[PDB]
C-alpha cells in the first residue's frame, strides 16, 4: 500500500515486477498505470522487447519480401 521511490513516497499503489508500456509517468524510472478488483500499479519502464541478432563472418541476411506502409505526421502551420 506504500512504496518508496527516488522522487519521494508513493502511497496508494502496488509495486509489481511486470514491465510494459505505461500511461501516467511519475519520475526516476517509476511509471504508473491503471489496469485490472482494479487498482493502480507502479513499476519500472520497459525499453521494448529483447532481440539478440546473430553474428558470424560468413552469414548474410537478404530480405525476400516487402510491405508498403503508410504513416501520418501532423505539423502545425
Amino acid at each position: 500500500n506504500v512504496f518508496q521511490t527516488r522522487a519521494g513516497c508513493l502511497i496508494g499503489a502496488e509495486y509489481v515486477n511486470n514491465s510494459y508500456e505505461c500511461d501516467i509517468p511519475i519520475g526516476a524510472g517509476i511509471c504508473a498505470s491503471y489496469q485490472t478488483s482494479q487498482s493502480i500499479i507502479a513499476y519500472t519502464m520497459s525499453l521494448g522487447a529483447e532481440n539478440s541478432v546473430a553474428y558470424s563472418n560468413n552469414s548474410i541476411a537478404i530480405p525476400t519480401n516487402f510491405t508498403i506502409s503508410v504513416t501520418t505526421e501532423i505539423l502545425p502551420v
Partner: protein, 224 residues
C-alpha cells in the same frame, strides 16, 4: 495494388475512430482557449484596491483619493497584458519553427524523392501526399519496408584465374551449393558474369576469398 489500396483505408478507419492523432492541432486551440480566458478572469481581481469596478472607485471617493486607487487598477491591467503579449510571442515562435519544418517537407518530400531517414517517414521514402488541416497540415508518407528475412552464405570476393573478382553492384550469396549474385533490398538470384564482376588485385591479399568459376558468355560464342 493489393497492399497500397488497403493501406490508405487503414488511415481512414483510424482517423474516424481515434481523435488523439489530431490532438497536436487541438493543443494549438486549447492554449489559445486558456489565453483568451486569461484576461476575462483578471477583471474580477481587486489588485489591492477595495473594488475592481472603476465606477465604484471614482464616484465613491474624493478625486485626490480616487487617483491612487485608479492607478493601481490600471497598472494591474497593464501587467495582465504584459503577461499575455509576451506569451503570444513565445508560443508563436514554436509555430514558426514548425512552419519552416513543414515547408521543408512540402519542398523535399512532396515535390521530389528524398534519401533522408526518419524525415519523410520511417524506412525508404517513395512519395508524400499532403492533406489540408485546420491550423496545420496532415502528411501521408508512402514508405518501403522489407518484411521477411532469410539467412544466406556470403564471401567478399571470388577467386578464379588468380585475380580477385569483386562485385560491381550487388552482394554475393549462396544456398550452400552454388554462389549467386543478388541485391541488398531483394532476392533475385543471377548467373555470375564478367559484366557483373570487377577484376582487381590477386587472391592472396583478400581475407575470406572463395573459389568458383566465373562464367564468360563469349566462350560459348567462339564456335557459334
Amino acid at each position: 495494388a493489393n497492399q497500397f489500396n488497403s493501406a490508405i483505408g487503414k488511415i481512414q478507419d483510424s482517423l474516424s475512430s481515434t481523435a488523439s492523432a489530431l490532438g497536436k492541432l487541438q493543443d494549438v486551440v486549447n492554449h489559445n482557449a486558456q489565453a483568451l480566458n486569461t484576461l476575462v478572469k483578471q477583471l474580477s481581481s481587486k489588485f489591492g484596491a477595495i473594488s475592481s469596478v472603476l465606477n465604484d472607485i471614482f464616484s465613491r471617493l474624493d478625486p485626490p483619493e480616487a487617483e491612487v486607487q485608479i492607478d493601481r487598477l490600471i497598472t494591474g491591467r497593464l501587467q495582465s497584458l504584459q503577461t499575455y503579449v509576451t506569451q503570444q510571442l513565445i508560443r508563436a515562435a514554436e509555430i514558426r519553427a514548425s512552419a519552416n519544418l513543414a515547408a521543408t517537407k512540402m519542398s523535399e518530400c512532396v515535390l521530389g524523392q528524398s534519401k533522408r531517414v526518419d524525415f519523410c517517414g520511417k524506412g525508404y521514402h517513395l512519395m508524400s501526399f499532403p492533406q489540408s488541416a485546420p491550423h496545420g497540415v496532415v502528411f501521408l508518407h508512402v514508405t518501403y519496408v522489407p518484411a521477411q528475412e532469410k539467412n544466406f552464405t556470403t564471401a567478399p570476393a571470388i577467386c578464379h584465374d588468380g585475380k580477385a573478382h569483386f562485385p560491381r553492384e550487388g552482394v554475393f550469396v549462396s544456398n550452400g551449393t552454388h554462389w549467386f549474385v543478388t541485391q541488398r533490398n531483394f532476392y533475385e538470384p543471377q548467373i555470375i558474369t564478367t559484366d557483373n564482376t570487377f577484376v582487381s588485385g590477386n587472391c592472396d591479399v583478400v581475407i575470406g576469398i572463395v573459389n568458383n568459376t566465373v562464367y564468360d558468355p563469349l566462350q560459348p560464342e567462339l564456335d557459334s
